Protein backbone atom coordinates (compact mmCIF):
# COMPACT_ATOMS: atom_id res chain seq x y z
CA UNK A 1 0.00 0.00 0.00
CA UNK A 2 1.38 3.36 -1.09
CA UNK A 3 0.77 6.63 0.74
CA UNK A 4 1.26 10.22 -0.42
CA UNK A 5 0.59 13.38 1.57
CA UNK A 6 -0.23 16.07 -0.95
CA UNK A 7 1.16 19.60 -0.85
CA UNK A 8 -1.40 22.02 0.62
CA UNK A 9 -0.84 24.91 -1.85
CA UNK A 10 0.30 27.46 0.71
CA UNK A 11 3.22 28.87 -1.21
CA UNK A 12 5.24 26.75 1.23
CA UNK A 13 6.45 23.16 1.35
CA UNK A 14 14.40 15.55 -8.20
CA UNK A 15 11.49 15.30 -10.64
CA UNK A 16 8.03 16.82 -10.34
CA UNK A 17 5.67 13.94 -9.60
CA UNK A 18 5.97 11.44 -6.79
CA UNK A 19 7.55 8.03 -7.34
CA UNK A 20 5.57 4.79 -7.67
CA UNK A 21 7.37 1.53 -8.38
CA UNK A 22 5.39 -1.32 -9.88
CA UNK A 23 5.94 -4.96 -10.77
CA UNK A 24 4.45 -6.72 -13.82
CA UNK A 25 1.37 -8.61 -12.62
CA UNK A 26 0.78 -6.96 -9.26
CA UNK A 27 -2.42 -5.14 -8.28
CA UNK A 28 -1.73 -2.75 -5.41
CA UNK A 29 -3.57 -0.03 -3.51
CA UNK A 30 -2.82 3.66 -3.11
CA UNK A 31 -3.87 6.15 -0.43
CA UNK A 32 -3.66 9.93 -0.75
CA UNK A 33 -4.20 12.20 2.26
CA UNK A 34 -5.80 15.43 1.03
CA UNK A 35 -6.17 16.60 4.63
CA UNK A 36 -3.53 19.33 4.48
CA UNK A 37 -5.25 20.94 1.48
CA UNK A 38 -8.94 20.40 2.18
CA UNK A 39 -9.09 21.06 5.93
CA UNK A 40 -8.56 24.86 5.65
CA UNK A 41 -11.25 25.01 2.97
CA UNK A 42 -13.86 24.26 5.62
CA UNK A 43 -16.88 22.99 3.70
CA UNK A 44 -18.47 19.61 3.09
CA UNK A 45 -15.11 17.92 2.60
CA UNK A 46 -14.32 15.90 -0.50
CA UNK A 47 -16.70 14.61 -3.15
CA UNK A 48 -16.42 11.41 -5.15
CA UNK A 49 -15.68 13.24 -8.40
CA UNK A 50 -12.07 12.22 -8.96
CA UNK A 51 -10.75 11.73 -12.48
CA UNK A 52 -7.69 9.75 -13.55
CA UNK A 53 -5.62 9.63 -16.72
CA UNK A 54 -2.63 7.52 -17.74
CA UNK A 55 -0.04 8.65 -20.28
CA UNK A 56 3.12 6.93 -21.48
CA UNK A 57 6.46 8.71 -21.39
CA UNK A 58 8.40 5.58 -22.39
CA UNK A 59 6.64 2.71 -24.15
CA UNK A 60 8.93 0.32 -26.08
CA UNK A 61 5.99 -0.78 -28.27
CA UNK A 62 4.91 -4.40 -27.87
CA UNK A 63 6.60 -7.04 -29.99
CA UNK A 64 3.76 -9.57 -30.11
CA UNK A 65 0.23 -8.51 -30.96
CA UNK A 66 -2.87 -9.37 -28.95
CA UNK A 67 -5.89 -11.18 -30.36
CA UNK A 68 -9.52 -12.09 -29.73
CA UNK A 69 -11.91 -14.94 -30.42
CA UNK A 70 -15.40 -16.24 -29.73
CA UNK A 71 -17.25 -19.46 -28.98
CA UNK A 72 -20.62 -20.65 -27.74
CA UNK A 73 -21.05 -22.11 -24.26
CA UNK A 74 -19.84 -25.67 -23.77
CA UNK A 75 -18.22 -25.66 -27.20
CA UNK A 76 -14.46 -26.08 -27.47
CA UNK A 77 -12.42 -23.33 -29.12
CA UNK A 78 -9.35 -23.81 -31.32
CA UNK A 79 -7.02 -21.09 -32.51
CA UNK A 80 -3.54 -20.19 -33.62
CA UNK A 81 -0.71 -18.60 -31.66
CA UNK A 82 1.79 -17.96 -34.47
CA UNK A 83 0.29 -15.24 -36.68
CA UNK A 84 0.50 -12.86 -33.71
CA UNK A 85 4.32 -12.59 -33.55
CA UNK A 86 5.75 -11.13 -36.76
CA UNK A 87 9.38 -11.79 -36.30
CA UNK A 88 11.93 -9.53 -38.00
CA UNK A 89 14.74 -12.08 -38.07
CA UNK A 90 14.43 -15.79 -38.74
CA UNK A 91 14.63 -17.86 -35.58
CA UNK A 92 12.71 -20.47 -33.63
CA UNK A 93 9.56 -19.84 -31.60
CA UNK A 94 9.19 -21.31 -28.10
CA UNK A 95 5.55 -20.69 -27.28
CA UNK A 96 4.57 -20.83 -23.61
CA UNK A 97 1.45 -20.35 -21.48
CA UNK A 98 2.48 -18.78 -18.17
CA UNK A 99 1.01 -20.89 -15.38
CA UNK A 100 0.56 -17.88 -13.10
CA UNK A 101 -1.55 -16.26 -15.83
CA UNK A 102 -3.47 -19.19 -17.26
CA UNK A 103 -7.21 -19.07 -17.86
CA UNK A 104 -9.73 -18.78 -15.03
CA UNK A 105 -12.68 -20.88 -16.23
CA UNK A 106 -11.18 -23.47 -18.54
CA UNK A 107 -8.03 -25.27 -19.60
CA UNK A 108 -5.69 -24.72 -22.54
CA UNK A 109 -3.70 -27.64 -23.95
CA UNK A 110 -1.02 -25.77 -25.86
CA UNK A 111 0.09 -27.78 -28.87
CA UNK A 112 3.69 -28.01 -30.00
CA UNK A 113 3.59 -25.30 -32.71
CA UNK A 114 1.52 -22.21 -31.92
CA UNK A 115 -1.66 -24.24 -31.66
CA UNK A 116 -3.90 -24.53 -28.63
CA UNK A 117 -7.30 -25.80 -27.54
CA UNK A 118 -9.47 -24.00 -24.99
CA UNK A 119 -12.24 -26.04 -23.36
CA UNK A 120 -14.49 -23.71 -21.33
CA UNK A 121 -15.70 -24.84 -17.95
CA UNK A 122 -19.09 -26.49 -17.81
CA UNK A 123 -22.05 -24.08 -17.79
CA UNK A 124 -20.00 -20.90 -17.96
CA UNK A 125 -20.83 -17.67 -19.80
CA UNK A 126 -18.56 -14.63 -19.73
CA UNK A 127 -15.07 -13.53 -20.79
CA UNK A 128 -11.85 -15.41 -20.14
CA UNK A 129 -8.22 -14.39 -20.54
CA UNK A 130 -4.82 -16.04 -20.56
CA UNK A 131 -1.40 -14.54 -21.20
CA UNK A 132 0.81 -16.37 -23.66
CA UNK A 133 4.55 -15.77 -24.00
CA UNK A 134 6.37 -15.96 -27.34
CA UNK A 135 10.17 -15.78 -27.06
CA UNK A 136 9.70 -13.81 -23.85
CA UNK A 137 7.24 -11.38 -25.42
CA UNK A 138 3.98 -11.33 -23.44
CA UNK A 139 0.57 -10.64 -24.91
CA UNK A 140 -2.95 -11.50 -23.85
CA UNK A 141 -5.52 -13.55 -25.74
CA UNK A 142 -9.15 -12.83 -24.87
CA UNK A 143 -11.92 -15.38 -25.41
CA UNK A 144 -15.59 -14.55 -24.86
CA UNK A 145 -17.95 -17.50 -24.41
CA UNK A 146 -21.37 -16.57 -25.54
CA UNK A 147 -24.54 -17.89 -23.88
CA UNK A 148 -25.61 -19.61 -27.11
CA UNK A 149 -28.32 -17.07 -27.99
CA UNK A 150 -26.57 -14.23 -29.85
CA UNK A 151 -23.32 -12.73 -28.53
CA UNK A 152 -21.44 -10.83 -25.81
CA UNK A 153 -19.58 -7.51 -26.26
CA UNK A 154 -15.90 -7.22 -27.17
CA UNK A 155 -13.82 -6.33 -24.08
CA UNK A 156 -11.28 -3.50 -24.31
CA UNK A 157 -7.88 -5.29 -24.17
CA UNK A 158 -6.59 -4.14 -20.78
CA UNK A 159 -3.74 -1.63 -20.94
CA UNK A 160 -0.24 -2.16 -19.51
CA UNK A 161 -1.09 0.06 -16.52
CA UNK A 162 -4.68 0.66 -15.49
CA UNK A 163 -6.90 1.80 -12.64
CA UNK A 164 -10.07 -0.30 -12.29
CA UNK A 165 -13.50 1.12 -13.07
CA UNK A 166 -14.99 1.62 -9.60
CA UNK A 167 -12.91 0.54 -6.62
CA UNK A 168 -12.16 4.05 -5.35
CA UNK A 169 -13.48 5.49 -2.11
CA UNK A 170 -13.07 8.86 -0.42
CA UNK A 171 -13.56 9.38 3.31
CA UNK A 172 -14.93 12.89 3.93
CA UNK A 173 -14.37 12.57 7.68
CA UNK A 174 -10.59 12.17 7.37
CA UNK A 175 -9.92 13.58 3.87
CA UNK A 176 -8.29 10.44 2.48
CA UNK A 177 -8.64 9.11 -1.07
CA UNK A 178 -8.05 5.45 -1.91
CA UNK A 179 -7.92 3.62 -5.22
CA UNK A 180 -6.45 0.52 -6.82
CA UNK A 181 -3.50 0.53 -9.22
CA UNK A 182 -3.14 -2.64 -11.29
CA UNK A 183 -0.24 -3.54 -13.58
CA UNK A 184 -0.78 -5.92 -16.49
CA UNK A 185 1.42 -9.01 -16.86
CA UNK A 186 2.42 -7.50 -20.22
CA UNK A 187 4.10 -4.43 -18.73
CA UNK A 188 7.70 -4.15 -19.91
CA UNK A 189 10.34 -3.46 -17.24
CA UNK A 190 11.96 -0.04 -17.36
CA UNK A 191 9.03 1.76 -18.98
CA UNK A 192 7.53 4.78 -17.23
CA UNK A 193 3.93 6.00 -17.13
CA UNK A 194 2.29 9.05 -15.57
CA UNK A 195 -0.95 9.22 -13.59
CA UNK A 196 -2.53 12.63 -13.02
CA UNK A 197 -5.23 12.81 -10.34
CA UNK A 198 -7.86 15.57 -10.45
CA UNK A 199 -9.69 15.67 -7.12
CA UNK A 200 -12.62 18.01 -6.48
CA UNK A 201 -13.62 19.55 -3.16
CA UNK A 202 -16.87 21.37 -2.36
CA UNK A 203 -17.76 24.43 -0.33
CA UNK A 204 -20.57 24.76 2.18
CA UNK A 205 -22.84 26.20 -0.53
CA UNK A 206 -22.08 23.96 -3.52
CA UNK A 207 -19.13 25.33 -5.52
CA UNK A 208 -15.90 23.55 -6.43
CA UNK A 209 -12.25 23.57 -5.38
CA UNK A 210 -10.22 21.60 -7.90
CA UNK A 211 -6.78 20.14 -7.20
CA UNK A 212 -4.36 18.39 -9.55
CA UNK A 213 -1.31 16.24 -8.87
CA UNK A 214 0.71 13.68 -10.80
CA UNK A 215 2.61 10.45 -10.16
CA UNK A 216 5.33 8.66 -12.11
CA UNK A 217 4.87 4.89 -12.33
CA UNK A 218 8.12 3.05 -13.09
CA UNK A 219 7.64 -0.55 -14.21
CA UNK A 220 10.47 -2.40 -12.48
CA UNK A 221 11.07 -6.14 -12.36
CA UNK A 222 11.60 -7.77 -8.96
CA UNK A 223 9.58 -5.04 -7.29
Amino acid sequence: MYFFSVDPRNGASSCCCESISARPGEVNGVMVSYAAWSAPLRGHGLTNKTTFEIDGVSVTPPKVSNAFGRTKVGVVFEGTLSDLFPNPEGEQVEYEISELNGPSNGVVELGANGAFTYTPGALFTGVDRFWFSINGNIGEYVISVDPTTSELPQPPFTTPVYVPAARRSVDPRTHVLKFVLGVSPAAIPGDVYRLTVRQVAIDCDGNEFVHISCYDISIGSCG
Binding site: G106, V107, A122, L123, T125, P147
Partner: protein
Amino acid sequence: MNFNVGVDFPSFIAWDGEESFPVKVDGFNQFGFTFKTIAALTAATTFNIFYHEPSDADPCVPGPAIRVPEVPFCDTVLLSEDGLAAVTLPETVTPDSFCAGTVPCMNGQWISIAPATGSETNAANVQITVTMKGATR
Protein backbone atom coordinates in the same frame (compact mmCIF):
# COMPACT_ATOMS: atom_id res chain seq x y z
CA MET B 1 -52.45 -49.43 -3.16
CA ASN B 2 -49.79 -46.97 -4.26
CA PHE B 3 -50.58 -43.30 -4.70
CA ASN B 4 -49.99 -40.87 -7.56
CA VAL B 5 -46.91 -39.69 -5.69
CA GLY B 6 -46.02 -37.71 -8.79
CA VAL B 7 -48.02 -34.65 -7.83
CA ASP B 8 -47.01 -33.80 -4.28
CA PHE B 9 -43.22 -34.28 -4.75
CA PRO B 10 -42.59 -34.49 -8.50
CA SER B 11 -39.10 -35.00 -9.88
CA PHE B 12 -37.10 -34.05 -12.96
CA ILE B 13 -33.81 -34.98 -14.60
CA ALA B 14 -30.92 -32.68 -13.69
CA TRP B 15 -27.96 -34.53 -15.24
CA ASP B 16 -28.63 -37.37 -17.68
CA GLY B 17 -24.92 -38.13 -18.06
CA GLU B 18 -24.29 -36.14 -21.24
CA GLU B 19 -25.79 -32.69 -20.69
CA SER B 20 -27.20 -30.76 -17.75
CA PHE B 21 -30.65 -29.24 -17.29
CA PRO B 22 -32.08 -26.34 -15.29
CA VAL B 23 -35.05 -27.29 -13.13
CA LYS B 24 -37.42 -24.65 -11.78
CA VAL B 25 -37.72 -24.62 -7.99
CA ASP B 26 -39.78 -21.47 -7.49
CA GLY B 27 -43.15 -23.22 -7.28
CA PHE B 28 -41.85 -25.36 -4.40
CA ASN B 29 -40.13 -24.60 -1.12
CA GLN B 30 -37.81 -27.57 -0.45
CA PHE B 31 -35.77 -29.81 -2.73
CA GLY B 32 -32.89 -32.27 -2.86
CA PHE B 33 -30.84 -34.48 -5.15
CA THR B 34 -30.66 -38.27 -5.58
CA PHE B 35 -27.42 -39.43 -7.16
CA LYS B 36 -27.20 -42.83 -8.83
CA THR B 37 -24.41 -44.57 -10.74
CA ILE B 38 -24.85 -46.86 -13.73
CA ALA B 39 -21.32 -48.26 -13.84
CA ALA B 40 -18.41 -48.51 -11.44
CA LEU B 41 -16.47 -45.28 -11.03
CA THR B 42 -12.71 -44.92 -11.32
CA ALA B 43 -12.03 -41.98 -8.98
CA ALA B 44 -13.87 -39.45 -6.85
CA THR B 45 -16.02 -37.26 -9.10
CA THR B 46 -17.06 -33.71 -8.21
CA PHE B 47 -20.03 -31.69 -9.47
CA ASN B 48 -20.58 -27.95 -9.27
CA ILE B 49 -23.93 -26.50 -8.21
CA PHE B 50 -25.38 -23.53 -10.08
CA TYR B 51 -28.44 -21.33 -9.62
CA HIS B 52 -30.07 -19.28 -12.37
CA GLU B 53 -32.11 -16.08 -12.36
CA PRO B 54 -35.15 -15.05 -14.40
CA SER B 55 -33.97 -13.71 -17.74
CA ASP B 56 -34.86 -10.12 -18.55
CA ALA B 57 -36.08 -11.03 -22.04
CA ASP B 58 -38.61 -13.48 -20.60
CA PRO B 59 -39.30 -14.29 -16.92
CA CYS B 60 -40.13 -17.94 -17.74
CA VAL B 61 -36.69 -18.86 -19.12
CA PRO B 62 -33.54 -19.06 -16.97
CA GLY B 63 -30.79 -16.54 -17.56
CA PRO B 64 -27.06 -17.12 -17.11
CA ALA B 65 -25.63 -19.62 -14.66
CA ILE B 66 -24.27 -18.21 -11.42
CA ARG B 67 -22.57 -20.50 -8.90
CA VAL B 68 -24.18 -20.88 -5.49
CA PRO B 69 -22.00 -19.81 -2.53
CA GLU B 70 -21.13 -22.19 0.29
CA VAL B 71 -22.68 -22.10 3.77
CA PRO B 72 -20.91 -23.76 6.73
CA PHE B 73 -22.95 -24.82 9.71
CA CYS B 74 -20.66 -25.47 12.67
CA ASP B 75 -18.97 -28.81 12.08
CA THR B 76 -17.63 -27.79 8.68
CA VAL B 77 -13.84 -27.78 8.50
CA LEU B 78 -13.06 -28.55 4.84
CA LEU B 79 -14.61 -25.35 3.38
CA SER B 80 -13.61 -26.57 -0.12
CA GLU B 81 -10.98 -23.83 -0.55
CA ASP B 82 -13.34 -21.81 -2.76
CA GLY B 83 -16.56 -20.84 -0.96
CA LEU B 84 -18.53 -22.34 -3.85
CA ALA B 85 -20.72 -25.33 -2.98
CA ALA B 86 -19.98 -28.65 -4.66
CA VAL B 87 -20.81 -32.34 -4.25
CA THR B 88 -18.31 -35.19 -4.51
CA LEU B 89 -19.43 -38.76 -5.05
CA PRO B 90 -16.79 -40.81 -3.21
CA GLU B 91 -15.06 -43.74 -4.83
CA THR B 92 -16.45 -47.23 -4.17
CA VAL B 93 -20.13 -46.56 -4.79
CA THR B 94 -21.50 -49.72 -6.38
CA PRO B 95 -24.11 -48.99 -9.06
CA ASP B 96 -27.04 -50.32 -7.05
CA SER B 97 -27.02 -47.72 -4.29
CA PHE B 98 -28.22 -44.11 -4.33
CA CYS B 99 -26.92 -41.08 -2.45
CA ALA B 100 -28.91 -38.04 -1.39
CA GLY B 101 -27.92 -34.46 -0.69
CA THR B 102 -29.02 -30.87 -1.00
CA VAL B 103 -27.86 -27.31 -0.45
CA PRO B 104 -28.82 -25.64 2.87
CA CYS B 105 -29.91 -22.35 1.26
CA MET B 106 -31.52 -21.93 -2.13
CA ASN B 107 -31.29 -18.66 -4.02
CA GLY B 108 -32.80 -17.66 -7.33
CA GLN B 109 -35.47 -19.59 -9.16
CA TRP B 110 -33.56 -22.44 -10.82
CA ILE B 111 -30.87 -24.95 -9.89
CA SER B 112 -28.39 -26.92 -11.98
CA ILE B 113 -25.63 -29.51 -11.66
CA ALA B 114 -22.63 -30.01 -13.93
CA PRO B 115 -19.41 -32.02 -13.59
CA ALA B 116 -16.42 -30.09 -12.32
CA THR B 117 -13.27 -30.18 -14.42
CA GLY B 118 -11.11 -33.26 -14.09
CA SER B 119 -14.04 -35.62 -13.52
CA GLU B 120 -15.87 -35.13 -16.82
CA THR B 121 -15.26 -38.64 -18.19
CA ASN B 122 -16.61 -40.37 -15.07
CA ALA B 123 -19.78 -38.27 -14.81
CA ALA B 124 -20.88 -39.98 -18.03
CA ASN B 125 -21.64 -42.96 -15.77
CA VAL B 126 -23.85 -41.19 -13.19
CA GLN B 127 -27.40 -39.83 -13.02
CA ILE B 128 -28.68 -36.90 -10.94
CA THR B 129 -32.29 -35.98 -10.44
CA VAL B 130 -34.11 -33.42 -8.30
CA THR B 131 -37.29 -34.02 -6.31
CA MET B 132 -39.10 -31.09 -4.70
CA LYS B 133 -41.58 -30.79 -1.86
CA GLY B 134 -44.85 -28.96 -1.20
CA ALA B 135 -46.05 -26.41 -3.74
CA THR B 136 -46.45 -22.81 -2.61
CA ARG B 137 -48.78 -21.77 -5.43
